[PDB]
Design a protein around this ligand. Structure first.
Ligand code: MET
Ligand code: MN
Ligand code: MN
Ligand code: NA
Length: 257
C-alpha cells in the first residue's frame, strides 16, 4: 500500500475537484427521455475540454467514458440508447485522469418524479458512505469502514453488495487495498497517513446477491431485480482524520439538486 506525501495530495485535490465538477455539470441534463449515451457524450467533452482523460474509456475494453447504472443495475452500467423514464433512478460514475492522477466519484440522480421508496434507498446509501468515510484516521482499521456502512444500511432493512468494493487510487485507477463495504470493527489492515482510496458502497433494497451480464461483460444487476443505489468519493488519510477530494463545489451532494 502506497504512502503519499503533501505534493501528491495537491494533485489528488485537483483531479477529484474536476471529477466532482463533471457531476455538478451533468445534473441539469438528467431528464426523462434523455439517453445515457447523450449523458456520456456530455461528460466526455466536459472532461477533455478541461485537459483531462476519462479513465473508463477502453479500461479493460470498457466501451464508454462514464458508467451509468439505472434502477436494478448495481454498478458498471454501459451508456446506451434507451430513453430514461420518469421515476427511474440513475448512478452516474466519473473518473478523470489529470496530470496522471485519478479522481473517482459517483452520485445518484432522480429522473423526473421519483417514488418514496427509491428516494429512501438513495438517502440511506449516501448516509452510509459518509458513516464509512467518517471513521477514517490513522490507526483506524479497514473493517471499521465496512462495519459503519453495513450497520447503517442494515438498520434500514437494506443489504450490502459483497462482490464489488472500493479501492486504492492515485497514479493507478485500481490499487491496493480493497475497501469492503461490509465488515467488523477492529479487523483488517491499519490505516496510515498518506493512503488514498475510494469509498463506494452499493446498497440493495432486497437481497445482496448480484449477477454479471453474460452479454456485455460489465453490467452488474441485482439477482432479485430489486433497486440498488451507490455513491462514491475519493479520499485521503491525513495526520488525524480524512480529506475528501471529490466534494461537489456547488454542494450538490445528494438529490434533490
Ligand atoms: C470501467 S470503470 C469501473 C470503475 C468502477 N465503477 C469504479 O468506481 O472503480
Ligand atoms: Mn467510480
Ligand atoms: Mn471506484
Ligand atoms: Na441502481
Amino acid at each position: 500500500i502506497k504512502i503519499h506525501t503533501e505534493k501528491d495530495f495537491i494533485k489528488m485535490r485537483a483531479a477529484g475537484k474536476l471529477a466532482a465538477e463533471t457531476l455538478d455539470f451533468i445534473t441539469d441534463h438528467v431528464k426523462p427521455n434523455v439517453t445515457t449515451n447523450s449523458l456520456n457524450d456530455l461528460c466526455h467533452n466536459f472532461i477533455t475540454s478541461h485537459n483531462a482523460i476519462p479513465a473508463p474509456l477502453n479500461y479493460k475494453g470498457f466501451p464508454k467514458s462514464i458508467c451509468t447504472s439505472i434502477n436494478h443495475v448495481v454498478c458498471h452500467g454501459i451508456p446506451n440508447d434507451k430513453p430514461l423514464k420518469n421515476g427511474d433512478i440513475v448512478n452516474i460514475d466519473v473518473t478523470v485522469i489529470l496530470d496522471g492522477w485519478y479522481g473517482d466519484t459517483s452520485r445518484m440522480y432522480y429522473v423526473g418524479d421519483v417514488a418514496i421508496k427509491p428516494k429512501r434507498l438513495i438517502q440511506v446509501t449516501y448516509d452510509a458512505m459518509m458513516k464509512g468515510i467518517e471513521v477514517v484516521r490513522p490507526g483506524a482499521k479497514l473493517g471499521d469502514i465496512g462495519y459503519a456502512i453495513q450497520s447503517y444500511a442494515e438498520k434500514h432493512n437494506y443489504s450490502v453488495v459483497r462482490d464489488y468494493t472500493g479501492h486504492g487510487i492515485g497514479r493507478v485507477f485500481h490499487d491496493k487495498p480493497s475497501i469492503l463495504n461490509y465488515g467488523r470493527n477492529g479487523t483488517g489492515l491499519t490505516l496510515k497517513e498518506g493512503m488514498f482510496f475510494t469509498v463506494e458502497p452499493m446498497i440493495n433494497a432486497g437481497n445482496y446477491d448480484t449477477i454479471l451480464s453474460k452479454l456485455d461483460g460489465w453490467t452488474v444487476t441485482t439477482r432479485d431485480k430489486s433497486l440498488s443505489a451507490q455513491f462514491e468519493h475519493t479520499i485521503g488519510v491525513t495526520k488525524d482524520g480524512f480529506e475528501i477530494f471529490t466534494l461537489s463545489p456547488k454542494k450538490l451532494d445528494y438529490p434533490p439538486y
